[PDB]
Swiss-Prot record:
It comes from the Eukaryota. This is Dual specificity mitogen-activated protein kinase kinase 7. Dual specificity protein kinase which acts as an essential component of the MAP kinase signal transduction pathway. Essential component of the stress-activated protein kinase/c-Jun N-terminal kinase (SAP/JNK) signaling pathway. With MAP2K4/MKK4, is the one of the only known kinase to directly activate the stress-activated protein kinase/c-Jun N-terminal kinases MAPK8/JNK1, MAPK9/JNK2 and MAPK10/JNK3. MAP2K4/MKK4 and MAP2K7/MKK7 both activate the JNKs by phosphorylation, but they differ in their preference for the phosphorylation site in the Thr-Pro-Tyr motif. The active site is at residue 136. Its cofactor is Mg(2+). Keywords: Acetylation, Apoptosis, ATP-binding, Coiled coil, Cytoplasm, Kinase, Magnesium, Metal-binding, Nucleotide-binding, Nucleus, Phosphoprotein, Serine/threonine-protein kinase, Stress response, Transferase, Tyrosine-protein kinase. Activated by phosphorylation by specific MAP kinase kinase kinases such as MAP3K1/MEKK1, MAP3K3/MEKK3, MAP3K11/MLK3 and MAP3K12/DLK.
Length: 269
């Protein structure tokens, strides 16, 4: 399980000295000198915070168990030393939040469609085969790379965007809030100065749905409306969401997410 890098089928026996630290992104960007592959490495120090190390080990436990899920960041191997644990994760491009910051505007629906089917299937995978509820769905946990892949981040994968009943299917509400934010470039609770004020607007105000003057398809507006159901007893589970016309459309439609991602990253900071 340890002392081996598995980068695309091939397994390599290696140690931490076989990796060149290319800087920080504690998550390091490191290069495998034997092959030239550039990977992400998380360093968990033995003397580190017990609360932080507990979350890292619990998240790693789910990641190692989720090798058969294509919509979850995978582990390439581990290196255990006397003072550190190095966790090799696949190097993703950037999170959806930084994509929103670099875009300085709305994200196209065709990108959010491929994003929706990837995150729902990831959440559905965590609950059915592992009984895991993410309990923290947000654009910062949605990772996209230069190859068009969309995967769930490993941070907090073992369990502002909080559902009404949380203040089971509460991650459905957080997904709907994330979709509205990315589709409009505006967080629907951006003028709230405190966390408690956000919770009040979630319960008191009507759910913030997609605008009808941005060319959004009826399937997109319907999927978001279903995700943002106030009553959790009437909010659809993942089995019902996977049968939505919005999901079925982007399960098969060829969307060039890779080229769109490269153009957004090519935009200057």
């Amino acid at each position: 399980q340890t002392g081996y890098l598995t980068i695309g089928g091939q397994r390599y026996q290696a140690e931490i000295n076989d990796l060149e630290n290319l800087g920080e992104m504690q998550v390091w960007k490191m290069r495998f000198r034997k092959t030239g592959h550039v990977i992400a490495v998380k360093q968990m120090r033995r003397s580190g915070n017990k609360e932080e190390n507990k979350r890292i080990l619990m998240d790693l436990d789910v990641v190692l168990k989720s090798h058969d899920c294509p919509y979850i960041v995978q582990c390439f191997g581990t290196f255990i030393t006397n003072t550190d644990v190095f966790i090799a994760m696949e190097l993703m491009g950037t999170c959806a939040e930084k994509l929103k910051k670099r875009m300085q505007g709305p994200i196209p629906e065709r990108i959010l469609g491929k994003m929706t089917v990837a995150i729902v299937k990831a959440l559905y995978y965590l609950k059915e085969k592992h009984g895991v509820i993410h309990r923290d769905v947000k654009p910062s946990n949605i990772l996209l790379d230069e190859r068009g892949q969309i995967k769930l981040c490993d941070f907090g994968i073992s369990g502002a965007y909080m559902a009404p009943e949380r203040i089971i299917r509460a991650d459905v509400w957080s997904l709907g809030i994330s979709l509205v934010e990315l589709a409009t470039g505006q967080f629907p609770y951006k003028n709230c100065k405190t966390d408690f004020e956000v919770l009040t607007k979630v319960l008191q105000e009507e759910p913030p749905l997609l605008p009808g003057h941005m060319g959004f398809s009826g399937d997109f507006q319907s999927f978001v409306k279903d995700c943002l159901t106030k009553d959790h007893r009437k909010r659809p589970k993942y089995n019902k969401l996977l049968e939505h016309s919005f999901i079925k459309r982007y399960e098969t439609l060829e969307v060039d997410v890779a080229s769109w991602f490269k153009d957004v990253m090519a935009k200057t900071e």
